[PDB]
Amino acid sequence: PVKDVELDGRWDDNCPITVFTDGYLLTLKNASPDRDMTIRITDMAKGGVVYENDIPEVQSAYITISIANFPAEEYKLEITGTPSGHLTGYFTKE
């Protein structure tokens, strides 16, 4: 099956945001689109951001991200909402 990327944090107002990876595609789903979002992925070796995307509310239900050309490394995944909401998970690209 696909691999769950567990998320921890606070997403005010069951968490509607879930993430999985299926091979080298990461999929985010949001069961209750209701705010603008930002997704940021940061490598854990240098703390460099490899991906950042500001996603308007209307487009926030579903996002795919190819991790296929990220270096083999562990990454921090953050999903933040405006004005609030902040979820964090971690995944490893092999």
Q: How far apart are CA 78 and CA 92, in angstroms?
A: 14
- The DSSP string of 28-93 is EEESS--SEEEEEEEETTT--EEEEEEE-GGGTTEEEEE-TTSPSEEEEEEEEEESS-EEEEEEEE
- Two structure tokens written together for 19: 């993430």
* Architecture in CATH for domain 1-94: Sandwich (2.60)
Q: Count CB-CB contacts under 10 A for residue 65.
A: 19
Q: How far apart are CA 93 and CA 37, in angstroms?
A: 24
Residue 77 · residue 63 · CB < 8 Å: no
Segments making up each domain of the chain, as ranges: 1-94
Residue 30 backbone dihedrals phi, psi, to 5 degrees: -130, 110
Experimentally determined by: X-ray
* Resolution in units of Å: 1.7
The bridge status of strand 36-43 relative to strand 49-55 is antiparallel
Residue type (1 letter), 41: I
Residue 43 · residue 73 · CB < 8 Å: yes
Our CA dihedral for 67, 29, 5, 25, rounded to 10 degrees, sits at: -20
